[PDB]
């Protein structure tokens, strides 16, 4: 590369501001890829003492999707330590109270349990809607691809694929439907 | 309602419906036959 020593070190250990989108994505897969980028495990120069984390900006956090019935089944439990501090709220209640708490807690759980976790959490940025601050937008590099594939509802199918799909059965002519 | 683990019809008018994730025996003519699965 023929760089000088200080610019070469700066280029090797510089930080990157990855972008990630919510909008019908599973919070666990978002948390998995965000936690990899926050740990810096995507870099070949990774080491736990090298401070090689990167910034992750997740948007559309309000529009996450849960597989199955997890919106009612999944329970987040906390304890304000006064006698009776035990509170249990469903994922739906937590989402309607705080729109980013579910993805924040998922990334916090997936991050390694050491003293660097709060620093990686500080480097994580979350936003509930399409609005992002201008400085972060000017920082952003590489919107990462979404894990899910947006299973594409019926009404926005094009007529070409609708009549390309063959009809499976012949209805009787005397049926009310 | 009476709480049961096995559900039985005691009338011809008793009918089984699955409501709120649980099976129920409802009878309109003999309301004492109202049963709830546990």
């Amino acid at each position: 590369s023929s760089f000088s020593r200080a610019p070469q070190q700066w280029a090797t250990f510089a930080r990157i501001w990855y972008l990630l989108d919510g909008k019908m994505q599973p919070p666990g897969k978002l948390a998995a890829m965000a936690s990899i980028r926050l740990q810096g495990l995507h870099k070949p120069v990774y080491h736990a003492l090298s401070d090689c984390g990167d910034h992750v900006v997740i948007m559309n956090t309000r529009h996450i999707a849960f597989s199955g019935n997890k919106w009612e089944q999944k329970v987040y439990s906390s304890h304000t330590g006064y006698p009776g501090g035990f509170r249990q709220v469903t994922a739906a209640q937590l989402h309607l109270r705080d729109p980013v708490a579910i993805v924040k807690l998922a990334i916090y759980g997936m991050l390694p349990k050491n003293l660097h976790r709060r620093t990686m959490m500080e480097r994580l940025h979350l936003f509930p809607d399409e609005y992002i601050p201008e400085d972060i937008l000017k920082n952003l590099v590489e919107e990462l691809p979404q894990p899910r594939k947006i299973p594409k509802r019926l009404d926005e199918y094009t007529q070409e694929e609708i009549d390309a799909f063959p009809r499976l059965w012949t209805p009787p002519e005397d049926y009310r439907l | 309602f009476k709480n049961k683990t096995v559900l039985k019809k005691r009338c011809k008018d008793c009918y089984l419906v699955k409501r709120r994730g649980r099976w129920y025996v409802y009878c309109k003519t003999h309301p004492r036959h109202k049963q709830r699965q546990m």
């Binding site: 910034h55 709060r118 620093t119 500080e122 480097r123 | -």
Partner: protein, 97 residues
């Protein structure tokens, strides 16, 4: 028409096997960034233009959260350390290349 990997980020990887089949030859010339893909470089009437040297002395707290907000860290990195650790630190470390 077949490439094992996309050919537009690092190098133009072309694989080959020798005639004996005993060794593999890889040819990888660097890919240069296009000019079209780049971006241009961004760009008192009476008195002196006196130099604006104000240095407000923030107290230890608000100083530390300003530094934490600036560098995306926590306060514990900025809080000081004792004489035991300060003298335990190696001030003449070994240095390779």
């Amino acid at each position: 028409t077949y490439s094992p990997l996309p050919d537009d980020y690092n190098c133009n990887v072309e694989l080959a096997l020798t005639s004996d089949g005993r060794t593999i030859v890889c040819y990888h010339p660097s890919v240069d960034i296009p000019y079209e893909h780049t971006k241009p470089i961004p760009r008192d009437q009476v008195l002196k233009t006196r130099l604006e040297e104000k240095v407000e002395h923030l107290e230890e707290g608000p100083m530390i959260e300003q530094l934490s907000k600036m560098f995306f860290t926590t306060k514990h990195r900025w809080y000081p350390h004792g004489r035991y650790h300060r003298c335990r630190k190696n001030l003449n470390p070994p240095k390779d290349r």
